Amino acid sequence: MGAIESRKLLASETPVGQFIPYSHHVTDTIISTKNAEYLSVWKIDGRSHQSASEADVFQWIRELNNTLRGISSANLSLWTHIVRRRVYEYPDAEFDNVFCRQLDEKYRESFTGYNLMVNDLYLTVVYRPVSDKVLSFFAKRERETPDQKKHRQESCIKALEDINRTLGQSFKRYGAELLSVYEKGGHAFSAPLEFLARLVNGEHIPMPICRDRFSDYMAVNRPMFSKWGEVGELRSLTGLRRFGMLEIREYDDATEPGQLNVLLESDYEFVLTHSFSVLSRPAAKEYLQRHQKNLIDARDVATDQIEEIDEALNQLISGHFVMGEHHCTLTVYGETVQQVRDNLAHASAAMLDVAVLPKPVDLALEAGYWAQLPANWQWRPRPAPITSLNFLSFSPFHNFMSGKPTGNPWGPAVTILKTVSGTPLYFNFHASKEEEDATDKRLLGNTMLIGQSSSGKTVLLGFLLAQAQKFKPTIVAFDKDRGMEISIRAMGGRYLPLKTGEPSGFNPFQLPPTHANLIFLKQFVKKLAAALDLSTHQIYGFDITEFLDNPEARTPVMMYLLYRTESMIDGRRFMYVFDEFWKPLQDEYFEDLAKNKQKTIRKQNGIFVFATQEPSDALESNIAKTLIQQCATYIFLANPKADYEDYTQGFKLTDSEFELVRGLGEFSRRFLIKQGDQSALAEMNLGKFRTIVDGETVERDFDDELLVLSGTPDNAEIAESIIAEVGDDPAVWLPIFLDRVKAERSD
Amino acid sequence: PVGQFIPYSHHVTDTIISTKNAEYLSVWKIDGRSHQSASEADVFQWIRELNNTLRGISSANLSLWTHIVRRRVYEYPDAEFDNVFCRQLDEKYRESFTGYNLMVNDLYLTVVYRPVDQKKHRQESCIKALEDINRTLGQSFKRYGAELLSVYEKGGHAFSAPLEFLARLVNGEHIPMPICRDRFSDYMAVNRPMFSKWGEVGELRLRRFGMLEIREYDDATEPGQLNVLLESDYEFVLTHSFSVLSRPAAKEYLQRHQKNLIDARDVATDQIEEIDEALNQLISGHFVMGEHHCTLTVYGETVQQVRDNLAHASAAMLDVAVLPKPVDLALEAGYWAQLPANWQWRPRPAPITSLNFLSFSPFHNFMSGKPTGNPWGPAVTILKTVSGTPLYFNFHASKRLLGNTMLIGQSSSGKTVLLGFLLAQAQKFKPTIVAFDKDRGMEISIRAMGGRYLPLLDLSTHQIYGFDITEFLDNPEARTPVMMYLLYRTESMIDGRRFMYVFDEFWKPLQDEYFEDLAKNKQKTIRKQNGIFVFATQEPSDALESNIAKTLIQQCATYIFLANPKADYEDYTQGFKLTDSEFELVRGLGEFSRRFLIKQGDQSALAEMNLGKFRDFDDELLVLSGTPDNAEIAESIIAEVGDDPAVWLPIFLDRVKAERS
Amino acid sequence: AAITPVVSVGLTLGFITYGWLIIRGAVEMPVAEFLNRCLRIGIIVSIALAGGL
Amino acid sequence: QPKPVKAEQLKSYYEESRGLERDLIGEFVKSRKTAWRVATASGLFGLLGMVCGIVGFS
Amino acid sequence: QLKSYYEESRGLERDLIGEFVKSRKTAWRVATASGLFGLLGMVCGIVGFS
Amino acid sequence: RGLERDLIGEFVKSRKTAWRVATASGLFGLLGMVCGIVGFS
Amino acid sequence: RGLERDLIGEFVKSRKTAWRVATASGLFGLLGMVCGIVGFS
Amino acid sequence: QERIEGEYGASELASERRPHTPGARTLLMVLLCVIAVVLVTLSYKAYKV
Amino acid sequence: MKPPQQQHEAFPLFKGATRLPTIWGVPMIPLMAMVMGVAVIALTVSIWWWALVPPLWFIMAQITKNDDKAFRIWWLWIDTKFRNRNKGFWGASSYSPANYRKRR
């Protein structure tokens, strides 16, 4: 009745464990299954697709298929998973500078109405011990002694571990990362289980390693599927999520590379899926013989009929592709049932645009939704055999460059930049393994901006150095033509405007007397011979503009400044920056000291942020070569004049990307970031726009910060005047500096 | 109606409620030991001793529920003084609390003993077994400070303390009930919950509540794992049960589990060997297993607020390596499973080792004292604490309870400010205060509180008096005479009136030969006569220099420890019965930290009395403390203006402001 | 001939099932087929009966 | 739902309470015993009636 | 001893009052079935006359 | 009142069950006797 | 006290007499029952 | 005694309905009318024979 | 935009996809289901009832030729969304996350 019915309804349910085929981690990278089918998950940073010639994606598919066809055992399987998702993990940053706070509030205001979503690719290469279903029909019933169960155990683990090594070696340019157990707080947290749980739950719940089968406790969201429909509903604590599945069932006379790219640019957060149950050469040859027989039992079409299947069968025997059973189920996530249907219709239009006729899954919604979890063939709706080249053409592991929002060595990403593609890039200095000589290290964090100036180079570097204060980083800025003075003053640090005819202001007279300091001072006076507190602030600046014409003085000035900054780096977040680097660095003395102290500094959170106006002038010298090759995060800028030799030979930039750089406008703000192998023609932009607040389109303009950040000796020579009249504090004199700016802006 | 789930019937002896199915029960009120005072070294020893005393009385009959109930305490009442200065102090200090936690934790352990002219002798055997179990548990919990809930007559209407806890479990609000001839199941519920038939949330008659089931098997990392819930912005009742299994039953369960794990298609040698280790760890490790379900029932006002509470709790427990599984249809069973002796309604219990039960509910709580119910009205004041829990300070901590208090610390470092604050806010009791002073510490404070402090004659005219002997402190000729005279005359006044002493420094009068024996005998006489000594000392080495001082210190109730970096190791360590870890916490405070470690009974916390903005506390401490220039200004004003307390205080404010400029 | 109710029930059930395709969304021959095939089979059965008499 | 119990006799109240509990349990088990005894007697007359009914059915 | 984890769990999960209510209810149900069977037999006999 | 009331109500329910069964058996035994002594002639 | 003693007296007298009449009437029912209902059988 | 306010009740998915192509009903009815008149004449001869 | 497109160099895809193993143009598993059903009918009511084969067999051929894998979808639906008991109570078919395997 009204009391006991709770238990009566409780015990009469089918738990989600019946549908989730997982169990104990057996190896730190491999998950078991109740049917003993061990699998591993492969997080992939898909390589860029926009910046490549059309033939070169063909070449990528060729290499990828060539590596696959070596290891594609008849016992394999693949589940790609491109889980488009929106970024909830990007914390708002505290700040102290008023100018920085204003800049960041304006910038984050400029993102009202933008796709803030990041692609996340995956791959789970699975390994069934036995291929043929007929004998496995018996094998599901027999009893095996534990020792032979162990024998199957090591056989499968070794086989899958070889597969993992081969895939890792084959994804060198794809930035792949095998996911494996990581420990938090004296307990084991699984890295793959979080992904497969995201497949089940729709959220990212950190899954610990408890003392049960994972099938028992891996679902924390009660799903609900409609009786007659295509959409469902996940009843969770944080809120309902309605999902509407979809299905592909009609191919065409084509496997054009990356035809499913259009769903990368989506406005709807979804989860694509695939499957490639690799299939035996006799069975594949029989399927192709069946197609041949059916076709040849008809009128003699001239060419589609005969020679095509001639070459198809001849390749299949000659080992150039491996057929397999495949199924793709795009599932869109949404908040209301109308909206998920709207997204489903959009996805159907997108798929029809690339000639793969989709039909929404209606009767097998639940079967499809349980067909996403890897190691589930019994739940796939429509497995249809295809060529392997074709499967790798339904999942070339293309991806827009996005970067890593969190998890970085310093923390959150420094800035977020508009991309011409549309998908936002989460910029950050620390790239992944450029040097590629040793795994255990601190992530290389350099940066090299190159390109003819006035195209925003000073604007760009000021923008990064203005937004990077969420880290509280020390900065030492060697600039040129007084451009950075206004910014460095705005960031509340000492800026020394070195100039001829005025006393230098700093000298080594009061240096400490220790024997190492005596060594340095002896070295300096041996180098000079030729023919207040520095610990006060955080963001320093020094101007070396007049030293470009000085052969002798560059060595003493840079020697002293660099030595003083050397004592600074004791583990605190330190960010050297520069400008037109080679001439300050065009010194015979400290190239060796620079490389050695570079290797030293890189450990305790050191960064070099280089710059350049004429990259042709830099690559010539010896010193600039090691520094070009020692920068992870390139940032190229545009130039009306370009040369093939410098950009390709020196900067490891491909031919298509070089033509892309040449194609850039003269003064259009567009700079090609190149963190690692991945590329993306991003553009931070400071144009006019509208704000959605109180129903008011409050016109907001970044020029009030452009005339601050942008380099102008003229503006600086009146900024210096107004600071001389009132030099109280940058937080205080900023409004009146803007006032005098408004006073001259019409004279 | 609702009695279909509540098993309670009636009492069998003063301390053992019965059950409908003859399952005798007992309730214990466990204060718990502080997990901040002692380092990580002693927590393991606590768990081990609890394991020892549990397996000592291990039997298949026993069982245990454990509840951590959090309250938004309202029983702490506002009090109106009869002096404007104290009212000002109270009003600003209370306004210093807008936005704080104001939540107390209570920990309850219940032991139920269900058996599995003979009949009468078996009734007697059952009750005797349960009372012996109670005696052993009480021997065990001496450090924790638990009290045995028992009947208490209130003016001819006998009541029953255990019914109150079992009521709060179901009613959700402390509704007192009498013991009467019905079966308590009929009327123990007053505000009956109304669970939504889908079972996501509930109701009460005001507060919506959703649940979480904390099903964990892995051995805990910390001896208290999910103690992050002890500090949170939501109320709950976290419940654990330990229905023991007889030793052969535990062996059989482990054997069946190992067999069903073996007979599978995948081999996992990280599990089978561990379980097989535990199976003969059980025989030789001597811990007895049992059933265990864990449920957290957060309360709220808005249903969306309850879901936000659940999400916060789920995150804050994933931070400690446990995964909460939300309850959707089992909520009715879960809630009716909270009542002790409701074995039937447990959702899905699974056997748990004894170490892991005592390490999931180890009886840790931030020390918080008694909000009310004290022998002297409510708690005098509500001190803050590190980690944000309100300590409800009071001098009466466990034949009236002992009240003598000592305040050991430097006079410059906030001793006098603290004493003035405590006396001013404890003026709500209207007790006589007989103040004694050193270096004119309390002259201005007493004269503000309407005393007749006599700087250096019957007590009926005023309530407060203060005698200053800082002039006559170190002059061995007649301290003993003057102290006999003051003590004798004050003692003549000691009858009926709620009474108090304050001694700023006592070790000089302590070495008196004649006076000390009289003090000890009068102490023995007064302990039942609402006597509250408030001792103090600038530095403990001054006190422990005298031997009799140790004898007087042994008879003290609450110790407050200011910040004294120059503290001798021996004094705090063995002289005052402090812990080594507490000695570390004393030194951890800076020179002028303004925090202090209050060892109250056998638990302690850092009562940080912070005078932040939101400041009027600056003005109050400016008038609270006493300096010779302050004293001369006060004396001049009092001489010229008159006697009344509040007439001169604005003039004093003006003159002191002029001095500060 | 009881084969007359027999053909009646079989042909009517077959027609109902075949027209259930439009709801089931497994046939893309809505107008031309559902008149043409139906009229062909109907004329065949009508001829069969008018011959049987 | 009446007022509190008479506090002058704590011992008497729960003394008679334990007495009542024991007597109730005893009477309920005795009632179960008589229940099966009556079930057996009812079965015996039922089969006597059935046997004579069949044998007298000519 | 009991030596059966199922036995101990089900012992905890069981209440005396409900078990005995069910026992006496089943005893009365069987007694009623036997009584009705006896009435059926007597009807059969009284028919068996004629 | 309360538990004692349950005890008293319980045994009086048992008593009226006894009266019911005794009445049914007395009437049904007298019925058996009367059908028999209807047969005997 | 008085009420409980009266209830116990009703217990003893009425319930014991109800089952005593149950036993005696059942035995008489059994005697007549066997007798006549075997007679005409 | 009423469903508890602001909670997740039954699904919003039961509101879904299968749309009908707005020609199936009318022509299906007319098709059954004609087939039925054929079948009735057929059983008229069936009984008559 | 226009991510990589085709210029007739696309890797050939042959229409041996979902050309299921079929006898007479019908897959083995569903045709065996029909054989079992018609055999049941023949053994149950009357033996003249292997004439029930050609009608439904032809309708199955027409179903399979149009939409090659209808029967797999049918069986998946029947097994999962048709078995789930409490479809009515929840307003939708749902599976409890916590594993209530009827144990205690």
Residue numbers in the entry:
A (entry chain A): 1 to 531, 607 to 822
B (entry chain B): 15 to 130, 147 to 235, 240 to 432, 441 to 498, 607 to 764, 775 to 821
C (entry chain J): 30 to 82
D (entry chain D): 5 to 62
E (entry chain E): 13 to 62
F (entry chain F), G (entry chain G): 22 to 62
H (entry chain H): 21 to 69
I (entry chain C): 1 to 104
Task: Tell me, in the authors' exact words, what the paper reports.
Conjugative type IV secretion systems (T4SS) mediate bacterial conjugation, a process that enables the unidirectional exchange of genetic materials between a donor and a recipient bacterial cell. Bacterial conjugation is the primary means by which antibiotic resistance genes spread among bacterial populations. The recent cryo-electron microscopy (cryo-EM) structure of the conjugative Type 4 Secretion System (T4SS) encoded by the plasmid R388 revealed that the remaining VirB proteins form a large assembly organised into four sub-complexes: the outer membrane core complex (OMCC), the stalk, the arches and the inner membrane complex (IMC). Previously, we solved the cryo-electron microscopy (cryo-EM) structure of a conjugative T4SS. In this article, based on additional data, we present a more complete T4SS cryo-EM structure than that published earlier.
From our previous work, the IMC is a hexamer of an IMC protomer which we defined as including two TrwK/VirB4 subunits (TrwK/VirB4central and TrwK/VirB4outside), one TrwM/VirB3 subunit and three TrwG/VirB8tails. We now define an “extended IMC protomer” containing not only the same set of proteins but also three additional polypeptides: the fourth TrwG/VirB8tail mentioned above, the TM region (α1 and α2) of TrwI/VirB6 (residues 30–82), and a newly discovered density, corresponding to TrwE/VirB10 (residues 21 to 69) (in green in Fig. 5A). In this region of the IMC, side chains are clearly visible and a complete model of the 4th TrwG/VirB8tail was built. In these regions of VirB10, the density was of sufficiently high resolution to build side chains. The interaction between TrwE/VirB10IM with TrwI/VirB6 α1 and α2 are particularly interesting because this binding site for VirB10 on VirB6 entirely overlaps with that of VirB2, the pilus subunit. As can be seen, the VirB10IM-binding site on VirB6 encompasses entirely the VirB2-binding site, and therefore, VirB10IM in this conformation would prevent VirB2 subunits from being recruited to the VirB6 assembly platform. Therefore, we propose that the regulation of pilus biogenesis is controlled at least in part by the interaction between VirB10IM and the TM region of VirB6. The structure of the T4SS we have solved, therefore, represents an early, inhibited, assembly state preceding pilus biogenesis. We, therefore, further hypothesise that contacts between donor and recipient cells may be required to release VirB10IM from VirB6, thereby freeing the VirB2 recruitment site and allowing pilus biogenesis to proceed.
